[PDB]
Amino acid sequence: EVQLVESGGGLVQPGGSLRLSCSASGFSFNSFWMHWVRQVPGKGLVWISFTNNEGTTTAYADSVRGRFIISRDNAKNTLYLEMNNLRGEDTAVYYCARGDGGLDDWGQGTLVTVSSASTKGPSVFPLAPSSKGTAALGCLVKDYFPEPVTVSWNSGALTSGVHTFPAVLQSSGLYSLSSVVTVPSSSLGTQTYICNVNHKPSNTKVDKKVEP
């Protein structure tokens, strides 16, 4: 297997429209109720909408009724959420889930950012280990908008001891974050360390080698 995948989220101007999709696989989609739930970053889960097996019954949260439309293409194994007249209070991660008892098999979610601020790619700077048994190193991902940014180390071959910090909004209104990793000092002579930064909203993909 059961899989639910949300897509179609991105930066949109206030007053704008956006269409979210939820692709279902590994089950008989047409036999289940489908739900949309949203989460404003750092806040709680807010139920947004649901549709029954064939889309004959639909319901909405008060905050979205009149602007949003839930629909399903059972033959295409897809749930949709058409969002109109978007406002800052709609900025959230949007999740889809299947019914029965409650909500199950929630997807990773899609981020919807409602803002008039420009898309801006980050600058990636190394946080190099010093010569002065464990060593720390990282990448500073600075001055971007909107969220998100993803960071991986050695193309995903390095996961242990990695801490990617939550992004913080700077005084400028641009986001900034650091991703760090503690490694054995014994590896610093031969082991290469590369942070793989991707900022899909700006088409910015950066691989940066951090050397001591």
Binding site: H35, V37, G44, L45, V46, W47, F50, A59, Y60, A61, D62, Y95, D100, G101, G102, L103, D104, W106, G107, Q108, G109, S123, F125, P126, L127, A128, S130, K132, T134, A136, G138, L140, K142, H163, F165, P166, A167, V168, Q170, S176, L177, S178, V180, T182
Partner: protein, 217 residues
């Protein structure tokens, strides 16, 4: 509509102990046919989608450990987590599946109380590539510590900095129950080249006396 009120908003319980989380509904969610209270419990772990734990107020989803159990009737519901494990770090939400809108409670943040862990302190000078750009970011890292309470102070040539630094804390680790923190000191290329000693001083429960990490420009 139906309002779901959770209590407390946040909770700190020790490893191996029991956590008790309340959920009160503004009205009955008991469906006479089927003889069930339509209450769900979800767990949302740091940086993860929510997971269904319990449906029909007391029916645990298959694969969910028996340490999790739901109870209650009418308007008063409870989620109990016995023998708290590190991987239980999450926010817990109750949800009403009786009548739309299928409303959630505001969530209950569950902090795992663990033994005191001193931070490993690392300092990073601004890169030469960033200095070319006209800005200098100095980074101080506090790695794998418990509890959250930490004092981080920047000293540039022993002069106590203020208003020029930002902090970011990671969510409690699901295996070792610690926090990690970054403190970023931001300066212009000009204000940065005016000084020599760049130091980060860390005060935390685990350290006998405040630790200092530094470099000379």
């Amino acid at each position: 509509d139906i309002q779901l009120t959770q209590s407390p908003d946040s909770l700190a319980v020790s490893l191996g102990e029991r956590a008790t989380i309340n959920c009160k509904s503004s009205q009955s969610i008991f469906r006479t046919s089927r003889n069930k209270n339509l209450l769900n419990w979800y767990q949302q772990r740091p940086g993860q989608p929510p997971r269904l734990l319990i449906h029909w107020a007391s029916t645990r989803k298959s694969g969910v450990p028996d340490r999790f159990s739901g109870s209650g009737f009418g308007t008063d519901f409870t989620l109990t987590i016995t023998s708290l494990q590190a991987e239980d770090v999450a926010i817990y939400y109750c949800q009403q599946y009786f009548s739309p809108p299928y409303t959630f409670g505001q969530g209950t943040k569950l902090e795992i109380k663990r033994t005191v862990a001193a931070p490993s302190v690392f300092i990073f000078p601004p890169s030469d590539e960033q200095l070319k750009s006209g800005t200098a970011s100095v980074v101080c890292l506090l790695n794998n510590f418990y509890p959250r309470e930490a004092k981080v102070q920047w000293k540039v040539d022993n002069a106590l900095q203020s208003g020029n630094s930002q902090e970011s804390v990671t969510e409690q680790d699901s295996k070792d129950s610690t926090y990690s923190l970054s403190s970023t000191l931001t300066l212009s290329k000009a204000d940065y080249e005016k000084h020599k000693v760049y130091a980060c001083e860390v005060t935390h429960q685990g350290l006998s006396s405040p630790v200092t990490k530094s470099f000379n420009r």
